[PDB]
Amino acid sequence: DDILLDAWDFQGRPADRSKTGGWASAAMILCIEAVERLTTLGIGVNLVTYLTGTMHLGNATAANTVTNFLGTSFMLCLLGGFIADTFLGRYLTIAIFAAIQATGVSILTLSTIIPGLRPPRCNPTTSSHCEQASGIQLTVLYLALYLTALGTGGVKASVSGFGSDQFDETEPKERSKMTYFFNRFFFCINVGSLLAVTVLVYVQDDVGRKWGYGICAFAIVLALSVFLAGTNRYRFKKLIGSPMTQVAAVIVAAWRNRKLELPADPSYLYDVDAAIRDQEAGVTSNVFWTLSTLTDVEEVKQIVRMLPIWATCILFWTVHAQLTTLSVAQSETLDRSIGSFEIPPASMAVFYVGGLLLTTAVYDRVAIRLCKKLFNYPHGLRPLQRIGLGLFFGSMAMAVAALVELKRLRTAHAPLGFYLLIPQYLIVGIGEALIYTGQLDFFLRECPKGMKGMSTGLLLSTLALGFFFSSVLVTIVEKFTGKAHPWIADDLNKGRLYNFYWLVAVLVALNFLIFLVFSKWYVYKEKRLAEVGIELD
């Protein structure tokens, strides 16, 4: 009754419901997730200008550095979950990796303080050119960045899952205590994330970096000690396995044997074909690294059916990557003067965060029940309709964003203009709050049974590439016409951005038509396969 077979406590003796439980104890875990999100935002959003305001980089190579650090921090999150799942706990994953996050962000705060560890002070845009940055002073910014990248990476992966282990016995009153707890919790993260792209951005911009990154490092060192102090209060998961494992064990363990085709149709052992090898194409099997089992082989193959739609997602995230880097540099040249108020350059990102929060809010009330009464589905847009939708806004921003780099270059070649960068922030914002619903929802129900959780893998990995390809996309345009003014600049007025924003708009516009064809097809095949699996028994 009171004791559960579902979890154990920090001893290992079976967990109890009125000893280990989350009306309180779920907070001490989760505050880490709060300080972490609030970090890679307050840092990541505005990391771009630190490199162009102090490190004195060229507005181009500040973008690549940031999108890479960002994308890197997204690859490393994909790994942390595999480590939580294969090797360490959920728990000592989030315990180990918050401590790591802490030194990275300490080494970072440190790098902005100790003297001569940043090039002597001055302003690059419209003013001067200074010192570059020493090869010494660039290596600590890297290690610290990349350490932070790794830290935020690992806990982003497991701190969420662990905090919810603190509630759900299938029993309702706990599930009620839980659902009660979180709707009150996210309003915070929301209202609190709105804080970090404004208030926190305000500090590192006005007061200075040391304080700005300092209040961060202190937050994780505070949080981690709250977390650990709750250790005994917690009840513990048994190591959910990463499904990414057998994907490795057929993509590889069917590679190590490439030999006689052996089509007898199917030979059996329990579920096995001996041999089993990957031909893609089709067969079908149902059941309940040396050699591989066929019912295992096929499950991988369903993962592969999802791959082309997986591909067409990457480019949205490139559009999103432009919001954190370039739209800052062109908020660097704009007005932003409210009189006695001067709004922080990278704080334009509050618009993007707004269109997230707002869209989600409009889409949970307005657009859900408006389908059950309108059509056969009360699910809203399930799933790939939201994905396609997002791709379209991917261009719609990059297209508008390309338009506004003209109205800006207009007035600045011949003083005051601003509030023209809302749309591109907003549009990527609304566009994001749909495509991430859709990417996710699709990756779930369409992921095989027992092998799902492959989802976040497909999800995050697209994020990562989105940034990495936005790194590549920038590095290509360097050679198109490289002399004179290419589309990149330092004084942006001495160069032209719109020529990039267009190309992303177009590259994405095409990407979306592609997605449409991939979308029509994928369902024709995953239907025919269903129907064929039956006809042949």
Ligand X SMILES: CCCCCCCCCCCCO[C@@H]1O[C@H](CO)[C@@H](O[C@H]2O[C@H](CO)[C@@H](O)[C@H](O)[C@H]2O)[C@H](O)[C@H]1O
Task: Give backbone dihedrals phi and psi of 185, rounded to 5 degrees, phi first.
Answer: -85, -35
Rg (CA), the chain: 25
- Closest distance of CB 436 from ligand X, Å: 13
Q: Which residues, 342 to 361, sit near ligand X by CB under 6 A?
A: 357-358, 360-361
**Of the candidates 164, 231, 284, 493, which one interacts with its own copies according to CB under 8 A?**
231
320 among the known binding-site residues?
yes
- Please enumerate in sequence order all residues whose Cβ is within 8 A of that of 480, keeping only pairs 6 or more positions apart, or say none: 486, 487
Distance between start and end Cα atoms, the chain: 45
139 binds its own copies (CB under 8 A): no
**DSSP H or E stretch at residue 5:** strand 3-9
229 binds its own copies (CB under 8 A): yes
What sign does the dihedral 12-16-17-22 (CA atoms) show? negative
315 binds its own copies (CB under 8 A): no
**Of the candidates 96, 144, 465, 504, which one interacts with its own copies according to CB under 8 A?**
96
Q: What does DSSP say about strands 14-16 and 235-236: parallel, antiparallel, or unpaired?
A: unpaired
SS3 at position 15? strand
SS (H, E, C) 441-459: HHHHHCCCCCCCCCHHHHH
184 binds ligand X (CB under 6 A): no
Supply 229's token pair: 């102090």
Q: Which residues, 166 to 225, sit near its own copies by CB under 8 A?
A: 218, 221-222, 224-225
Question: Could you tell which of its own copies, ligand X, none binds residue 357, using a CB distance below 5 to 8 A set by kind?
Answer: ligand X
Question: Could you tell which of ligand X, its own copies, none binds residue 102, using a CB distance below 5 to 8 A set by kind?
Answer: its own copies
Residue pair 9/16 in contact (Cβ under 8 Å)? The answer is yes
12 binds its own copies (CB under 8 A): yes
Supply 31's token pair: 């505050």
Residue pair 411/442 in contact (Cβ under 8 Å)? The answer is no
Output 206 or 364, the one with its CB closest to ligand X: 364
Residue pair 193/39 in contact (Cβ under 8 Å)? The answer is no
**Of the candidates 23, 142, 180, 186, which one interacts with ligand X according to CB under 6 A?**
186
**Stretch near its own copies under the rule CB under 8 A, chosen from 90-98, 168-176, 353-361, 372-380:** 90-98
Question: Could you tell which of ligand X, its own copies, none binds residue 514, using a CB distance below 5 to 8 A set by kind?
Answer: none
- Closest distance of CB 229 from its own copies, Å: 6
324 among the known binding-site residues?
yes
Which of the 8 DSSP states describes residue 102? H
Q: CB neighbours (10 Å) of residue 325?
A: 28
240 binds its own copies (CB under 8 A): no
- Please enumerate in sequence order all residues whose Cβ is within 8 A of that of 349, keeping only pairs 6 or more positions apart, or say none: 45, 197, 201, 323, 324, 425
Question: Could you tell which of ligand X, its own copies, none binds residue 100, using a CB distance below 5 to 8 A set by kind?
Answer: its own copies
110 binds its own copies (CB under 8 A): yes
Question: Could you tell which of ligand X, its own copies, none binds residue 529, using a CB distance below 5 to 8 A set by kind?
Answer: none
Output 87 or 187, the one with its CB closest to its own copies: 87
Output 332 or 432, the one with its CB closest to ligand X: 432
Rounded to whole angstroms, the Cα distance separating 463 from 443 reads 14
**Stretch near ligand X under the rule CB under 6 A, chosen from 20-28, 187-195, 208-216, 280-288:** 187-195
Which of the 8 DSSP states describes residue 242? P
Question: Could you tell which of its own copies, ligand X, none binds residue 96, using a CB distance below 5 to 8 A set by kind?
Answer: its own copies
100 binds its own copies (CB under 8 A): yes
Q: Report in angstroms the alpha-carbon separations of 455 from 85, 434, 436, 452.
A: 14, 17, 12, 6
**Of the candidates 180, 187, 268, 419, which one interacts with ligand X according to CB under 6 A?**
187
Q: Which residue has the tokens 């309702």?
A: 172
Question: Could you tell which of its own copies, ligand X, none binds residue 10, using a CB distance below 5 to 8 A set by kind?
Answer: its own copies
Dihedral over alpha carbons 203, 204, 205, 207 (to 10 degrees): 60
Output 110 or 514, the one with its CB closest to its own copies: 110
144 binds its own copies (CB under 8 A): no
**Of the candidates 125, 190, 198, 231, which one interacts with ligand X according to CB under 6 A?**
190
125 binds ligand X (CB under 6 A): no
- Closest distance of CB 228 from its own copies, Å: 4
Q: Which residues, 32 to 61, sit near ligand X by CB under 6 A?
A: none
Question: Could you tell which of ligand X, its own copies, none binds residue 87, using a CB distance below 5 to 8 A set by kind?
Answer: its own copies
- Closest distance of CB 373 from ligand X, Å: 18
**Of the candidates 92, 191, 304, 523, which one interacts with its own copies according to CB under 8 A?**
92
**Of the candidates 364, 410, 482, 523, which one interacts with ligand X according to CB under 6 A?**
364
What sign does the dihedral 329-199-396-524 (CA atoms) show? positive
Residue pair 205/346 in contact (Cβ under 8 Å)? The answer is yes
DSSP string, 23-67: HHHHHHHHHHHHHHHHHHHHTHHHHHHHHHHTS---SSHHHHHHH
82 binds its own copies (CB under 8 A): no
Residue pair 178/168 in contact (Cβ under 8 Å)? The answer is yes
Residue 405 β-bridge partners: none
Residue pair 488/60 in contact (Cβ under 8 Å)? The answer is yes
Residues that bind ligand X (CB under 6 A): 183, 186-187, 190-191, 357-358, 360-361, 364
Known binding residues: 320, 324
Residues interacting with its own copies, by CB under 8 A?
10, 12, 87-88, 92, 95-96, 99-100, 102-103, 106, 110, 218, 221-222, 224-225, 227-229, 231-232
* Binding-site annotation: residue ranges for substrate: 320, 324
